[PDB]
Write a protein that binds this ligand. Structure first.
Ligand SMILES: NC1=C(N)C[C@@H](c2nc(-c3ccncc3)no2)NC1
Length: 340
């Protein structure tokens, strides 16, 4: 508990709270950009590569359909996402540069990270070596230390949401389930393979669900597949609440010991949620070679640099059908999104 770390987190919370209490709004508009390519797509929104017409800079624009947000009951979650993203600041979190709305849509304009998703690189290589997995895991440990000290839970850790930048480091994206929480919270949300047992059982839960998800991620990076999988979600949930996990023989003894303490079904015994907090993780034998300050300062040479030609290259993302960005002549759902 060195005073330099305590003072760092105290200042981090001061700066977050000032932006949290006075958010920015309406800092660009759609016809300031040229549309280039669809980078991914979902049930109420998509992400598109765009170019700013006056500066030439590239950005990733997240577009949400207001009517579909209402129908799928995601109003509060969408308002959480933009308010948190405009208030945070950390080396491994993606930067929000603009936000605005119009008659039909909500827009969040982020920095474009051209190296692609961790998911693509993991599946192409097969599995990551333990030093490679540990480089990425250390970045997530520091990011969760930051978020939890601001009373934020993240709730969507998985390889699809971790983007690899030009230096080989992580940028975390997608804050659609992130929330400010003083105590417990109760919403059923997340991705099935990564959910903690207390979410599945409809209990009130806390930041310990992020430390469970870190155990799932480290297992998946080091093995090539997640610890709990099956064809139907109900079958995945039965394996999770049992907590029975089998480890490949190539895992080191230190790795198995860390994973047994992160994938602990009893949340009151889980690493990250004991009296010493994150320091039970930082001081574990599996992290003995990690220089925590050098990682934060980005002074460690990364194990892998993505191949791409420049800031507008899309070769590390995949191909989707290209659809219109339509804006109605009439305003939709104006009252619901007043504060956006
Ligand atoms: N399943 C999900 C994806 N598959 C993509 C992800 C997301 N990616 C970006 C992005 C930011 C900057 N540069 C490139 C991409 N923003 O959100 N949302 C969830």
């Amino acid at each position: 508990e060195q005073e330099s770390v305590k003072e760092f987190l105290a200042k981090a919370k001061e700066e977050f709270l000032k932006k949290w209490e006075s958010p920015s709004q309406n800092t660009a508009q759609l016809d300031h950009f040229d549309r280039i390519k669809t980078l991914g797509t979902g049930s109420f929104g998509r992400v598109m590569l765009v170019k700013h017409k006056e500066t030439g800079n590239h950005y990733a624009m997240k577009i949400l359909d207001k009517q579909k947000v209402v129908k799928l009951k995601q109003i509060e979650h969408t308002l959480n996402e933009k308010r948190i993203l405009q208030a945070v600041n950390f080396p491994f979190l993606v930067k929000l540069e603009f936000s605005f709305k119009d008659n039909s849509n909500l827009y969040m304009v982020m920095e474009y990270v051209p190296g692609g998703e961790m998911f693509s690189h993991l599946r192409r290589i097969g599995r990551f070596s333990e030093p490679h997995a540990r480089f990425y895991a250390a970045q997530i440990v520091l990011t969760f230390e930051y978020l939890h000290s601001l009373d934020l839970i993240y709730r969507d850790l998985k390889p699809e949401n971790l983007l690899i930048d030009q230096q080989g480091y992580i940028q975390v994206t997608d804050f659609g389930f992130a929330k400010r929480v003083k105590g417990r919270t109760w919403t059923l949300c997340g991705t099935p393979e990564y959910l903690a047992p207390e979410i599945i059982l409809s209990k009130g839960y806390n930041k310990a669900v992020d430390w469970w998800a870190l155990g799932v991620l480290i297992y998946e990076m080091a093995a090539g597949y997640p610890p709990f999988f099956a064809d139907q979600p109900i079958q995945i949930y039965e394996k999770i609440v049992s907590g029975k996990v089998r480890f490949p023989s190539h895992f080191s003894s230190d790795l198995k010991d860390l994973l047994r303490n992160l994938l602990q079904v009893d949340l009151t015994k889980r690493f990250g949620n004991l009296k010493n907090g994150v320091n039970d993780i930082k001081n574990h034998k599996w992290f003995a070679t990690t220089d925590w300050i050098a990682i934060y300062q980005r002074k460690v040479e990364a194990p892998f640099i993505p191949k791409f030609k420049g800031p507008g290259d899309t070769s590390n993302f995949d191909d989707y059908e290209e659809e219109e960005i339509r804006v109605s002549i009439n305003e939709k759902c104006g009252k619901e999104f007043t504060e956006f």
